[PDB]
Amino acid sequence: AWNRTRISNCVADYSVLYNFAPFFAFKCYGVSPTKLNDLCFTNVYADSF
Amino acid sequence: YWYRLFRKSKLKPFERDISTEIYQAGNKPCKGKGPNCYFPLQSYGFRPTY
Numbered sequence: 001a002w003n004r005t006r007i008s009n010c011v012a013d014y015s016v017l018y019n020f021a022p023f024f025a026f027k028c029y030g031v032s033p034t035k036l037n038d039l040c041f042t043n044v045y046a047d048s049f
Numbered sequence: 050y051w052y053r054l055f056r057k058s059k060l061k062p063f064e065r066d067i068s069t070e071i072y073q074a075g076n077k078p079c080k081g082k083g084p085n086c087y088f089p090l091q092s093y094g095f096r097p098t099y
């Protein structure tokens with residue numbers, strides 16, 4: 001039962017959090033942002049596992 | 050029969066990948082675990098039952 005983490009109408013700058021926790025399995029299959037602040041998109045379908 | 054999962058060199062037309070060292074993914078020298086780094090060679094399960 002993943003969380004509806006709807007990332008819309010804001011700047012998805014979650015790359016700073018890379019330094020907050022030691023992210024180990026960083027498999028970005030379509031886009032690999034070490035910084036993420038520009039594009040606006042409709043649907044994100046973010047999930048928590 | 051494995052494949053180059055990661056590499057630190059952008060591929061261009063008619064060029065071969067040879068280096069298989071750990072793909073460094075952090076500003077600090079990354080060797081193995083810790084940062085996002087992983088071994089860039091995953092085994093393919095070529096089974097006849099698949």
Ligand SMILES: *[C@@H]1O[C@H](CO)[C@@H](O)[C@H](O)[C@H]1NC(C)=O
Pocket residue numbers: 017020021022
């Ligand atoms: C959350 O923030 C704390 C510091 O307040 C940090 O130690 C921890 O790793 C962070 N976790 C994530 C996933 O951001």
